[PDB]
């Protein structure tokens, strides 16, 4: 694990899927380690270390951030028999804080730190970093359609919803955000009022919701990710 | 104005290439 995450064939720039299915399968053996009760291995072998779970969790694969979610869900599946309080208890709740702040909370400059990384950075980075509209900039793009491994994807799972509802409305737009989906109901108004859409979505995070129906489905690679939304989360709790 | 560069590391390095082309043409050819 230490030398597949190293930046010289694995980066963000220069891509190299060969070193994410390494990743992947290394992240499905630690899964199926950590089902076997039987074994008294010790507790430090299942973590990683920090430095690999937040750059692996800031990469751009939608396999491997469902693979990174499946890893968490089994150590903490292991570690709920653990005490509440132990050395990497604390750093597994890091983890899941940083990454669901990262995926669905859209709260990163009101945190502490995102991924060891101080939000001061963070919102620098998004000034001088034009934005066409700015009606919404800091909240448009850090959700699970703001993922760049997971934007696109989420279009295409609205696009599968609204054929699967014979909808005669299709959203135009190719960017499933705040800003976009206050357009798109501002637009057709009084056809969003009574049919034509998705049923039981009134606003952004039911659409979010009813979007993690379809990646919980047996059609996906992507369960791990809508257990790890519907595990994690109180609001989505019931979902499960 | 887009100060692309932090303010620490901008001392160094020669920004004029954006503004003037003629600096970019004369340190091309």
């Not at chain 1, 983890?95 to 995102?114: A, E, F, G």
């Not at chain 1, 049923?199 to 790890?228: E, W």
């Given at each position: 694990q230490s030398l597949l995450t190293?930046?010289?064939?694995?980066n963000n720039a220069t891509s190299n899927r060969f070193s994410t299915m390494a990743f992947i399968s290394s992240l499905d053996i630690l899964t199926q380690l950590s089902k076997q009760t039987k074994s008294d291995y010790a507790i430090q072998y299942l973590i990683v270390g920090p430095d690999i779970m937040n750059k692996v969790f800031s990469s751009d694969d939608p396999l491997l951030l469902s693979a990174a979610c499946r890893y968490l869900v089994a150590t903490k599946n292991k570690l709920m028999q653990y005490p509440s309080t132990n050395k990497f208890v604390r750093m597994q709740n890091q983890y899941i804080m940083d990454l669901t702040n990262y995926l669905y909370r859209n709260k990163v400059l009101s945190s502490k730190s995102l991924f060891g990384v101080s939000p001061d950075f963070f919102k620098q980075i998004l000034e001088?970093?034009?934005?066409?509209?700015?009606?919404?900039?800091?909240?448009?793009?850090?959700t699970i359609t703001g993922i760049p491994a997971l934007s696109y994807i989420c279009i295409i799972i609205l696009r599968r919803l609204e054929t699967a509802e014979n909808?005669?409305?299709?959203?135009?737009?190719?960017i499933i955000n705040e800003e976009t989906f206050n357009n798109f109901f501002r637009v057709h108004h009084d056809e969003i009022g009574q049919h034509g859409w998705i049923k039981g979505v009134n606003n952004i995070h039911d659409l979010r919701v009813k979007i993690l129906m379809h990646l919980s489905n047996?059609?996906?690679?992507?369960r791990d990710i809508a257990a790890f939304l519907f595990t994690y989360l109180k609001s989505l709790s019931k979902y499960s | 104005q887009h100060q692309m560069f932090d303010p620490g590391v901008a001392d160094l390095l020669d920004t004029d290439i954006l503004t003037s082309p003629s600096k970019r043409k004369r340190k091309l050819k």
């Amino acid at each position: 694990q230490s030398l597949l995450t190293l930046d010289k064939i694995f980066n963000n720039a220069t891509s190299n899927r060969f070193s994410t299915m390494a990743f992947i399968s290394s992240l499905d053996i630690l899964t199926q380690l950590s089902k076997q009760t039987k074994s008294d291995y010790a507790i430090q072998y299942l973590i990683v270390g920090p430095d690999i779970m937040n750059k692996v969790f800031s990469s751009d694969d939608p396999l491997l951030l469902s693979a990174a979610c499946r890893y968490l869900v089994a150590t903490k599946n292991k570690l709920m028999q653990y005490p509440s309080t132990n050395k990497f208890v604390r750093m597994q709740n890091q983890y899941i804080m940083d990454l669901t702040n990262y995926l669905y909370r859209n709260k990163v400059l009101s945190s502490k730190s995102l991924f060891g990384v101080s939000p001061d950075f963070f919102k620098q980075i998004l000034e001088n970093l034009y934005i066409p509209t700015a009606d919404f900039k800091n909240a448009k793009f850090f959700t699970i359609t703001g993922i760049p491994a997971l934007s696109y994807i989420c279009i295409i799972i609205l696009r599968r919803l609204e054929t699967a509802e014979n909808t005669k409305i299709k959203f135009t737009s190719g960017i499933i955000n705040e800003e976009t989906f206050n357009n798109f109901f501002r637009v057709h108004h009084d056809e969003i009022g009574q049919h034509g859409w998705i049923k039981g979505v009134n606003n952004i995070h039911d659409l979010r919701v009813k979007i993690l129906m379809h990646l919980s489905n047996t059609a996906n690679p992507y369960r791990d990710i809508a257990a790890f939304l519907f595990t994690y989360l109180k609001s989505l709790s019931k979902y499960s | 104005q887009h100060q692309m560069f932090d303010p620490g590391v901008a001392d160094l390095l020669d920004t004029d290439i954006l503004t003037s082309p003629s600096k970019r043409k004369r340190k091309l050819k």
